[PDB]
Design a binder for this molecule. Structure first.
Ligand SMILES: *[C@@H]1O[C@H](CO)[C@@H](O)[C@H](O)[C@H]1NC(C)=O
Ligand SMILES: *[C@@H]1O[C@H](CO)[C@@H](O)[C@H](O)[C@H]1NC(C)=O
Ligand SMILES: *[C@@H]1O[C@H](CO)[C@@H](O)[C@H](O)[C@H]1NC(C)=O
Ligand SMILES: *[C@@H]1O[C@H](CO)[C@@H](O)[C@H](O)[C@H]1NC(C)=O
Lengths: 172, 58, 172, 172
């Protein structure tokens, strides 16, 4: 949550969203509609799908090792074997703990960043025609029908042809 | 020859980092010193390890 | 300093700030005032308060181990014991170095992000009534008395009722 | 790529840029010009120049160790030596893999953040005189000659004296 989008200014998730991870809910004269953003969801999923194969490539293959369970008490050599195994176990347990903590932190920051990136991309499409209400939801200042909305979601929103009407609505 | 625990002796000699040998005066009374063999030919004749003294009966 | 708030566009800390970590300094007709933001300070402190218990949970308990100091010179077994202990010490020293470096980097990025998040939250409260002067300080374009300022700090700033006066002051 | 500047809203690198890492391309009445930003490039280079001396300070110095290659087959002690060496090798290989992955991720995020920071600094200089076109390129709304542009790049852009003309050009 480094960017304050998720659990920040969005303030709420959408349990009704099953199409993807990030998406839009629009409301205009025609009526409320909902869609999912495939590009951001795919980017986040792609960055998450591995994330453990990129550090621990795979399981290495160990065949013959030392004895790790002993019946009698020998002394020096058994002490050394027990010490070596305990040291290895402690070091690998620490590696696991730290790796999982780092990966979880980065995953959370990554998804937050994807949400923020989608918000900023949308805000940059609506140059002057819309105002950010602050709850993660844009107020667009002109007649924007479903074709308009799907152009916003598409990334081909033509801001120039609504600029005059939007500016007149905003600043009166 | 044969060195029981050869690895340990090789390790400690290597760690010491020197072959500096100080001859001491050992007094072997009643035995013959400087034994040798034809397997270890020093010069033209029989010999032995230079740091070891083969004591035989006198 | 990934967001450029701290040591970035804020450019200066406040040694006179002792109430919290992040806060506001306002100046209006009545006079200069200063306050601290409790929510951001508490969030940063909460994220920092642990940060070492979450990786190294605690100290594990070791009772009987190998000998680590030797009087005479044995050979193979003493060499192996010395090697095992030296290997463990080197690995744990590297773990300590890397862990501290990572935690420090993340702490710095975290506090920078909290500063940026406070700035963005404030900017989103003042939708069109204020302009970011760029030095981390907002110019509000209307009569904003101490009740107005404490509403900004509160998070209940009502932007709608100053919109006309502010817009008239900005664009003439 | 946590901020979406590089490979995000900039969308393209400049192979013609050899002066520095980050820079400006301006176009006005006089003609197209290009320059590099020395401050951001120097900051990124400074943060990258070390980045491996700060974790692995140097090479430690090892002189006498255990034997790692064996001719005959002894049993317990040779098994223990082989196990110790294999454990050390595996742990250090994991350390190398994780360290390189973390450093690469942070370097990418760092350079992306520097690009975003330069963009935001420039945007804050042009308070109301310019509009972000969204492709990482600003449309300035007034006569801005080469002295104007080099003032923008300098960081001494005087926004107040173009505010009226720019606002008139924007909102008509
Ligand atoms: C979205 O944009 C693409 C290309 O920009 C276009 O082919 C398509 O018809 C648009 N509308 C959709 C996919 O509904
Ligand atoms: C080796 O050194 C010792 C003392 O340093 C000396 O007495 C001896 O003669 C030396 N022998 C040779 C072959 O250099
Ligand atoms: C701040 O807001 C809360 C609730 O929004 C309100 O109860 C309080 O009176 C406000 N002013 C303060 C805490 O000074
Ligand atoms: C840039 O600014 C500095 C100080 O702000 C000034 O001395 C210099 O003349 C300006 N122009 C340049 C470096 O081209």
């Amino acid at each position: 949550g480094l960017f304050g989008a998720i659990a920040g200014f969005i303030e709420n998730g959408w349990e009704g969203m099953i199409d993807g991870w990030y998406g839009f809910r629009h409301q205009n004269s025609e009526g409320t509609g909902q869609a999912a953003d495939l590009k951001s969801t795919q980017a986040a999923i792609d960055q998450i799908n591995g994330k453990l194969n990129r550090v621990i490539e795979k399981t290495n293959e160990k065949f013959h090792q030392i004895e790790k369970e002993f019946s009698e008490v020998e002394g020096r050599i058994q002490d050394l074997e027990k010490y070596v195994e305990d040291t290895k176990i402690d070091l690998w347990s620490y590696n696991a703990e730290l790796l999982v903590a780092l990966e979880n932190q980065h995953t959370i920051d990554l998804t937050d960043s994807e949400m923020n990136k989608l918000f900023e991309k949308t805000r940059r499409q609506l140059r002057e025609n819309a105002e950010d209400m602050g709850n993660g939801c844009f107020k667009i200042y002109h007649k924007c029908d479903n074709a308009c909305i799907e152009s916003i979601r598409n990334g081909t929103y033509d801001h120039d042809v609504y600029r005059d009407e939007a500016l007149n609505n905003r600043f009166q | 020859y044969d060195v029981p625990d050869y690895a340990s002796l090789r390790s400690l000699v290597a760690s010491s980092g020197t072959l500096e040998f100080i001859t001491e005066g050992f007094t072997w009374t009643g035995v013959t010193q400087n034994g040798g063999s034809n397997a270890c030919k020093r010069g033209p004749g029989s010999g032995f390890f230079s740091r070891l003294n083969w004591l035989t009966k006198s």
